[PDB]
Amino acid sequence: NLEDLKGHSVREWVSMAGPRLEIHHRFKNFLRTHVDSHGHNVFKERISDMCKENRESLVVNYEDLAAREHVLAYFLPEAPAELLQIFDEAALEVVLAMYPKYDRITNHIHVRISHLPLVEELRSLRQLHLNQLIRTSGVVTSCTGVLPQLSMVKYNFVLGPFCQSQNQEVKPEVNMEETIYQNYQRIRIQESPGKVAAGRLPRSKDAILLADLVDSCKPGDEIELTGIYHNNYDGSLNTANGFPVFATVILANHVAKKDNKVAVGELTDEDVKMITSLSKDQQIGEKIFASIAPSIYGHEDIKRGLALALFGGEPKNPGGKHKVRGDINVLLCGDPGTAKSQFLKYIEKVSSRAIFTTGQGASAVGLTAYVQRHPVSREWTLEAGALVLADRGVCLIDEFDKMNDQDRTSIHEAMEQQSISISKAGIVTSLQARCTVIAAANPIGGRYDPSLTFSENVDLTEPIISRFDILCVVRDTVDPVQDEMLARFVVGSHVRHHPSNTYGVEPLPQEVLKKYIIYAKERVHPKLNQMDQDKVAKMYSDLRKESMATGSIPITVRHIESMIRMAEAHARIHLRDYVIEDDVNMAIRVMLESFIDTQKFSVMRSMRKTFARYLS
């Protein structure tokens, strides 16, 4: 029996030939026969996906292995290096069996473990975890470049191959041509700021990434790290401490961004089937709109605009000399206590890459990019701010009206040209910043005055206001029926979400919505082939006539391009590869309804009458 150890450690047990062969056979059988709840061969699909993409890593979910091979699951945390080597060999055998020509692409398959149940904090690691497989989490604070490390060394006659370990120089000049190398990366992982007690210095660890594990994470990332806790003698540590203390490091096996994030690649065939079937539904647009912050009583315009901003438009560059952004920026502005901050928090929770910041807590350089001073290396370096870090993501700005003016003017270039240009301290460069900006503001005096226009209510000027594709006015009006409905919804929300436990359509589950969004943003690129140019052109002229007469908001060419983005975003919501007439009509309605809301109360009736033909 494999479980029974005849007076050896687990390492010793798995080192000898008999148990080694038994483990190899068991793991190969697990790879070949494991099926899911429906009965589909999991690893047949996983290996096919790996080989189609020409990748070298096979990910194994610890729970499945424990369910099917409990003895191997028990062994794995105690003797990780040996078990992982055996798993690699068996995986290579299976892969070559399925794809006999794959040996040309790679000669090694890495088995990587996910969902390890033994989670530990950076602060909690003790000597009893040494040489064990552990799972921890934190913030990446420092990251090297990808470096070449000796793997199989040859010396100059030419000496025989020599293996290289992570802890000492090998003992036989090196022959560069005949030597074998590996990718090497060192990261520093730190306690997340939200988990360290206030006023306390955070703890940190070092981690080593090898081979195809490199570039799995970037500084500033929230990561879950599974690896081997390893110690090695260090003389200068001993000198420093006066005691024989050993240096520690994590030999990384699996790196994930695990704050509720699923990548397009991780989507399975059944997931895509469900997404496509959903997109076939006739009311899918309404269902997606209803999925935006379901615990808020209806603010249906805000939810629609936020859904459009989440899905996004299509960037274009006709001849390589005229760049047009595809992102849709949103500005919420209205009375206090109307759930603007809750909308922003929901967007932060649902998006894959989102950064939340507030009012006076944001500085100009902190938003875009800053110049870091150093005491010893090159004096000055360039470091990414919020907009750079949120590239291809979302930046949410709360208390947008309370910002310092100098700090608010720093986002103009990023909002339109989608780049940050820095000319400081010998650094002249431009960084990419393609992010959707969603801001929330309060009006002048803390209350929106219906007798005035939007421009009169806010202190923002034309240049910043024009950069927002969608403008939403949140009004808190006293109506007995609406007040009763809101009260009955909110109290029911507090009943439903006790810790013990308008569209007329059922919203999508949040996990389903997250999969749907990632698929549409990655696998759908709607194309604008045909459009009623005369209708859009006539509409634009009418809008510019009325805007000049009333002065409620400025209208620019940017308003034409916003409509095209909204039509593209609407088509993307339906998983359509070509924008159609109903997308253009919806984009027109969204823009005209927004414009009418910026008028004074008296003028609103006339404005609806002026544009009634479109709003029909």
Binding site: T239, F243, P244, Y346
Partner: protein
């Protein structure tokens, strides 16, 4: 091998003490404690020195005088005492801690004559270092003969075997360390300082290095005042010593072979086996279990008392005369509501904020001080702050490193507790803007040079404020008397006013109360319940999460409709959620599982009197 008679005798006698010493109840005191050492995380046993002194005085004296010499043998005795239980691996190491040393020494009494003796000191922790694994006994492979050498002792320096175990082998230089069969211990270095009480007059503070091991690691925090029990040792200059496996790394004694032509100096460090504070996953059932039987019946009696609301109010604030409504509001704040999370991952605030606007010398500071002294986790601060952090975070630059770091403010330090803020109207603009998010979202967000963070501020705020003119004007409304903005005012659940009543009777009552408190400090105070009783009762009551019933639902909806119909201050959804929170707190006050209509009635009474006071003169 030569045998140390004294150490072996100490080992035998300590084993006898562990086996035989009897508690008051007649059971073996330390058998039941050693029974806990079967867990992987537990490796240390705490032994009272008074028990050992009672059992055997000669043993205690020998241990005190030869602690450093005999400590390994005491640990071996503990290992033997634990050996019987099957769950312990043969490789596990166990350590002994000594708790109650009758005599104490000052940091400036740590002289050479104390080297190796058992000592107790007090100090304020200045700095803590990261945890390390430290080698205590190495296992080596001999490269000449492949023999395995075990239990090689380490002395401040990485030491390899001197001679190969095999009699035939003559090796002295070539060995290999095997980590998997070596023994390590957790290691932490802390730097402590003299306490302000101990610091001699007109003297620069004297600092000390302390080494914590095994369970003692991460048990003392910078700024804490701690008692350390252990021993004073000398640590040589490792940088000077050369060994076969380890070269030397770049007056004292001369002449050692490992020294070459170099000198060896020494420095004094304290090796602590026990750390304690100098002045010393929850659920209702566990809270009950932590309590003794007397305390549990007292808590039950408190829960059954029909005048509990008034008795608690009077007990908490005995020095203050009048202002019953303010006491009721502060009590409800202390009990709190039920925080909740939505299906989409957003949070519904459950904490309660209260504001007290007062005339000069109206005892609002007294309310804040009473709450601060009562609460276990509470921070008292001022709106006008001495540090750049203020009530929220600040970003400051380390000159040497040039790095930017967060300095925490009051609301961060009070996370999961109560923040009493005095002079709430003197805040600065940065704090004013940040407090919106802090009060509603319970988070503080920063995106500045070198810092990108979301910090927790889950706090209940009790604020004290002055009117704009310096005297409250009854003709005006409360909104007209204070300089708080309407958005900030909407974030407070309750508002109270304290007016100087130019009345002879009130003056006579207040003067009598103050003079009586000063004349008879002990006799003046008469509490139906002691503060410890209330602390235990609050701890028990916070574990209840009352559920809103249907009838309470209807009543709350009707009350909100009435408030909106009645009405830049306005009734928002925040008033509705404040009413929900107050009803939940009222139910919690009686350790109840459902919010009944009576609780809603009381909460609405309080909130309606707050809103009316906000609106009308």
């Amino acid at each position: 091998e030569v045998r140390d008679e004294v150490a072996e005798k100490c080992q035998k006698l300590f084993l006898d003490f562990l086996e035989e010493f009897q508690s008051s109840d007649g059971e073996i005191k330390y058998l039941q404690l050693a029974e806990e050492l079967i867990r992987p995380e537990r490796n240390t046993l705490v032994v009272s020195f008074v028990d050992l002194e009672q059992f055997n005085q000669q043993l205690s004296t020998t241990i005190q005088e030869e602690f450093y010499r005999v400590y390994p043998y005491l640990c071996r005795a503990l290992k033997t005492f634990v050996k019987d239980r099957k769950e312990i691996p043969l490789a596990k190491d166990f350590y002994v801690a000594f708790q109650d040393l009758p005599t104490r020494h000052k940091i400036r009494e740590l002289t050479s004559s104390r080297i190796g003796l058992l000592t107790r000191i007090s100090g304020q922790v200045v700095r803590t270092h990261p945890v390390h694994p430290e080698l205590v006994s190495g296992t080596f492979l001999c490269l000449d003969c492949q023999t395995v050498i075990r239990d090689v002792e380490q002395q401040f320096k990485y030491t390899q075997p001197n001679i190969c175990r095999n009699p035939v082998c003559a090796n002295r230089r070539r060995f290999l360390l095997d980590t998997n069969k070596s023994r390590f211990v957790d290691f932490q270095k802390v730097r402590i300082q003299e306490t302000q009480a101990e610091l001699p007059r007109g003297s620069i503070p004297r600092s000390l290095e302390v080494i914590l091991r095994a369970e003692a690691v991460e048990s003392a925090q910078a700024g804490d005042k701690c008692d350390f029990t252990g021993t004073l040792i000398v640590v040589p200059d490792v940088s000077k010593l050369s060994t076969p496996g380890a070269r030397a790394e770049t007056e004292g004694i001369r002449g050692l072979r490992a020294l070459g032509v170099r000198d060896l100096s020494y420095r004094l460090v304290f090796l602590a086996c026990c750390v304690a504070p100098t002045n010393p996953e929850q659920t209702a059932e566990s809270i009950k279990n932590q309590m003794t039987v007397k305390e549990w019946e007292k808590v039950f009696e408190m829960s059954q008392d029909k005048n509990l609301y008034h008795n608690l109010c009077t007990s908490l604030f005995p020095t203050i005369h009048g202002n019953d409504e303010v006491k009721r509001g502060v009590l409800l704040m202390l009990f709190g509501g039920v925080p909740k999370t939505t299906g989409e991952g957003t949070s519904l605030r459950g904490d309660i904020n209260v504001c007290i606007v007062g005339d000069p010398s109206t005892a609002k500071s007294q309310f804040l001080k009473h709450v601060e002294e009562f609460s276990p986790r509470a921070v008292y601060t001022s709106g006008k702050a001495s540090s750049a952090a203020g009530l929220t975070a600040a970003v400051v630059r380390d000159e040497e490193s040039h790095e930017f770091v967060i300095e925490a403010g009051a609301l961060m330090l009070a996370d999961n507790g109560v923040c009493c803020i005095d002079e709430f109207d003197k805040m600065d603009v940065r704090d004013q803007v940040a407090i919106h998010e802090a009060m509603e979202q319970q988070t503080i967000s920063i995106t500045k040079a070198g810092v990108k963070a979301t910090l927790n501020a889950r706090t209940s705020i009790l604020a004290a404020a002055n009117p704009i003119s310096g005297h409250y004007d009854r003709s005006k409304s409360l909104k007209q008397n204070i300089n708080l903005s309407a958005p900030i005012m909407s974030r407070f659940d309750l508002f109270f006013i304290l007016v100087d009543e130019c009345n002879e009777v009130t003056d006579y009552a207040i003067a009598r109360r103050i003079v009586d408190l000063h004349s008879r400090i002990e006799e003046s105070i008469d509490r139906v319940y002691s503060l410890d009783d209330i602390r235990r009762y609050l701890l028990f009551a916070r574990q209840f999460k009352p559920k809103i019933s249907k009838e309470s639902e209807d009543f709350i909806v009707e009350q909100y409709k009435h408030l909106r119909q009645r009405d830049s201050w306005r009734i928002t959804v925040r008033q509705l959620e404040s009413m929900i929170r107050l009803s939940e707190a009222m139910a919690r006050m009686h350790c109840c599982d459902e919010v009944q209509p009576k609780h809603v009635k009381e909460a609405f009474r309080l909130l309606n009197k707050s809103i009316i006071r906000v609106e009308t003169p």
